[PDB]
Amino acid sequence: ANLWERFCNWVTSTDNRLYVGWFGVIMIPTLLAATICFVIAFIAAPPVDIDGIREPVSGSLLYGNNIITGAVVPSSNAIGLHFYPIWEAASLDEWLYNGGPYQLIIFHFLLGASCYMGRQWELSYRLGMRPWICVAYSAPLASAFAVFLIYPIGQGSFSDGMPLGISGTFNFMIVFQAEHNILMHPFHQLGVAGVFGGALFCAMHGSLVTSSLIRETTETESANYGYKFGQEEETYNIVAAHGYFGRLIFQYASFNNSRSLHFFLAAWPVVGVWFTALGISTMAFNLNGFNFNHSVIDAKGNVINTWADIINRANLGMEVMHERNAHNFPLDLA
Amino acid sequence: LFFQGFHNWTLNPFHMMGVAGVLGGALLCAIHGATVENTLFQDGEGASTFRAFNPTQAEETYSMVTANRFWSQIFGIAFSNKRWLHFFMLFVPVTGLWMSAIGVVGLALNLRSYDFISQEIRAAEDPEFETFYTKNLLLNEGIRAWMAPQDQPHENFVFPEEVLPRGNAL
Amino acid sequence: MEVNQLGLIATALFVLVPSVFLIILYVQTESQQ
């Protein structure tokens, strides 16, 4: 009944429509701050000298951008990895030219998103659940860390973190392929496998359960009203589903245990996305995709091109054009 | 890479709907597998929860009630209907692939979403006007001229060095 | 920006027509109960 104990009980209460928790105490302010800065910047920020060459790039709607082209531009290469809060600028005008909003947004989002993961652990503890939904979320959270933090650390500059917009995203992934040959990296290939695999298994599982709904309805009503929230009996027939999928392929390639099947659904996209987040994180230290440029030559020693060498011709066209005014010396070492 | 340099396929809203369906599927796949695995009933004594399922049991093996409360409070909304849930897992990735099929059909014909006209008019008239939209087309322009002769041998493209688009130093 | 003028009526109808259809069917659903 002491004033602190009562606060602690509200924070951790299972009765708030939205759970707060000790993690929620950091998350709420930092996400509200990143959110509000982002919304304002996207709409109204003036142009930003991302590449530190006094060539500002317009990112917001009021400066002639649409939903597809707008972005909060990353902070100036001139800043590199230096901290740049508002209070280090001589004025908001300076802070805006050099791209301060981006730093503010990413740090607060990374924090609140970290606490988001932990908040998932927390409520699971308070509800008597098993604990690992948060392990699943760490795959996307790790992805956000790689492109907003890890990649800039290893290249030495936040100007090279992922822009916060739709075309900026594509710009980031084009330059990435030119500099890292990421398609030829096995961890991106496992990401594609994680991600294609995930869509496949989602559709499979969704179609197998849907295929074996037990008749509880008429033709004139949704099959969905055959399930009632909290009913104890399962709402589909799992052995009829296993019966069909075993024969579509062969018996032993089909689950008859729903716990293994659902664990499989969780493991496949999580693991693959860990790897492809690791791929971005290790390419941050420039351990790049396989390089077979000129790996095939004839008896005389002519180059005999493969598809790798074609890939490289396109990587070259990305290379020579990106950040066209920003390089004074022949190699783009960062 | 061909479709990026020649079609600017990433800018096509039918591909974007494909992306949201594939990644949405993968999301749904992970999140539904992890929810079930962490809302399980305790039906066996041992620490491997797999043993405690029986394929023939009528009783559900995880709690839809504790799953629904969890996600309502973490995320604000949650599923309440198991049939809609699993039908939605069918719907999301199936539809996204269908939308991207349509887009590629457009590209059969070079009917690309390659440009935004308003942007080009301004940038032509205003050399201080730069966006990520204009930067990406420079890259597309790099790809086309550098890969085309080797990639389309039958066109006998000959591009002497002076005509190749290149930024400074590189 | 020099932008397609019918863009506005196109976007406004693209939203209003399907949205209104859904509202009509929701509200006559509540009145049944």
Binding site: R17, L18, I43, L61, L62, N66, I67, K228, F229, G230, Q231 | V65, N68, G76, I77, S80 | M1, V3, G7, L8, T11, A12, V15
Partner: peptide, 30 residues
């Protein structure tokens, strides 16, 4: 007018969020 349109649609989405969460049909057991 493009800007006004973009931001009006965005703002409608945020309001839908509000009603989707706090004014949801409340799930009822069995």
């Amino acid at each position: 007018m493009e800007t006004i349109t973009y931001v009006f649609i965005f703002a409608c989405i945020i309001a839908l969020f509000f009603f989707a969460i706090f004014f949801r049909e409340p799930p009822r057991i069995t």
